[model samples]
Target: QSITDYNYKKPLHNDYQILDKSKIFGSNSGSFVMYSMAADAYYIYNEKESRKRYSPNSTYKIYLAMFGLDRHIINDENSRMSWNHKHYPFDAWNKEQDLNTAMQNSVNWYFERISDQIPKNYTATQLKQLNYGNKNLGSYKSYWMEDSLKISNLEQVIVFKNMMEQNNHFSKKAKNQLSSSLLIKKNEKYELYGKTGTGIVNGKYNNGWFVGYVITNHDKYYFATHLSDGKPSGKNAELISEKILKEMGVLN
Candidate 1:
């Protein structure tokens, strides 16, 4: 069928979703996408843009956290790592960190250090196992940045849900370790898990993203948002996604 028809079909019913922030991001051309496990469908704005790949930036840390944990780099999510005297532009990152705080703050040095310890061959193998986007780790160490590795919003959501399910997608024990760190907030009705990322292209901060899932007592909702020209940043990624969630009446 036609592309527009294909996208419309996934969103399904009227009690589905709302696409807002993409318009703001659309000012510079961007996209947003969500998959409702409860409904078993997809909701998207700018379907073409949603499939276009770009650097995942810090969002890749979601999986990197799992990779480290799986290899026993740290005991678990609560496990801590001492600073290696690495200097970072972000003040909060210059000290000791754990999977919990590191994921929350998106500390570059923390993941970079873990990545160094883990063999690139191992990481590449894991990425292939996850069927990650393009599945190319590239030559540079920080390849998840604006480098060889890139992921589309669509791929982000698919991999995210697959990992969450841990059904032959990722090692369950490893995914659970990272899942603890992904918890941003939880109430009686629902629990939220997510990661945001920022990418610099052509020496300018131009790509922004938020990708994660929400679990309710009854159902799970997975989502991915990508904005071009960096209209919304990391934390703002949560803000915008929440706005849409509330729009769909998922969060009260």
Candidate 2:
């Protein structure tokens, strides 16, 4: 598809403007920020001026999931890592679950387990392979936590594009496994797979995020979208994703 399909217009839906101070903060304090849907490949948004970049948050789980498969760490049956409630300071005590459930719920502990078990350098290597981030491995943490990693929208789109490349660094098997794992359901028309992220840093406000790809008989597309300085909740990210997916005609 051409690049012009992702533009954002005025008057946000669901009391959500692309960028509105009132929606983000209070009447006079917050600024509403919406990204251009079409600015996937190094285009500029006039309002932000500079290039757009933000943390991928929990959306990074997809990478983790793929890594698990690529490394033979887990498979569809073993995708879910049991949630341990006994872990100190974590509220999810005594919970046992697997990858699909954990991903659906956006569980933090499961991803933490994957990061802890996987080599510290795995994410960095994958990032490099995808040509994502600033090539600054120092910024990415091996442990999974809210706000531990960051990426620009442009960078994220690049990674998605790379994933589409047939002979790229990632093995075709790995990509196929990731695609299969991410597919939420199937029907006559489309297959959808996605992950959502929301978290707080320094006790101020939360950021919301969604990243995934959709497949149809005719085409496959990957997308990433986020909202910073708002309430970080799965609901928020899912709401934004729903709008974009519907607009793209992936959903009825």
Candidate 3:
């Protein structure tokens, strides 16, 4: 379903004061969108920015994990891949990575290895079936990154919300496991599940994203936030989201 077509009833909004220049030291422009299961409502900020499509980056990992699991490519939640011996940055990515930790750490090499194994044709078919982004696989390998695979914060919530629903027609175990990988925090009241993503194109950054759903006793709330500054430095999308959710009283 096109996000442009999905009718979101009256949206609750504000001056979007949640984002302060002092706090998000790296970003100058962005958007935020939230879907509340409790009241079946939406809260949106910066319709233009939030709706603009951009590379999804690591945010796509959530579904990649599910795809690998569903296709029998990844063994299980503990699926592991060895380092390719490629000298690189980030000591963390230099070691062996399991699926869970890969997600927790947003290790691209692991998924790259996993993606390397999936046939390009199959990946393209899956992308369309999932109604993901523009469904443009600009070549099998580079599409989801600084490549052609682009999505918006608005669609992110809808896609995730659909995946969360029992009726989205995907593997229950896969969905459950993918969701579990997003666990970022816990409290007596809520469990925050999310992923942070950085988008770089032509060796320059352009998109920063944090996307996920929050689970509480009475409801599950879906949200997506992005700082579209064309620089590698966008504040942690997770922190941006956290600030907004707290101000909206969803995380309290």
Best by lDDT: 1
- Among all windows of 10 consecutive residues in model 1, the one with the lowest summed lDDT is 1-10
The 0-to-1 C-alpha lDDT of every candidate, in the order given, reads: 0.76, 0.55, 0.75
- lDDT digits (tens) for residues 62-145 of candidate 3: 878877887877765458788888876888888888877899888888888778777878778777776676777766775688
Clashes of each: 0, 15, 0
**Which candidate order results from sorting by TM-score in descending order?**
1, 3, 2
Candidate 3 lDDT score at position 51:
67
Candidate 3 Cα misplacement greater than 4 A, ranges:
1-27, 201-204, 230-235
lDDT of 1 by residue, 206-241 (tens): 778889888888888898877765454655566677
lDDT of 2 at 167: 77
lDDT of 3 at 224: 88
Candidates in order: C-alpha RMSD to true structure: 5.0, 8.4, 4.8
Query: Against the true structure, candidate 1 has what lDDT?
Result: 0.76
RMSD of 2: 8.4
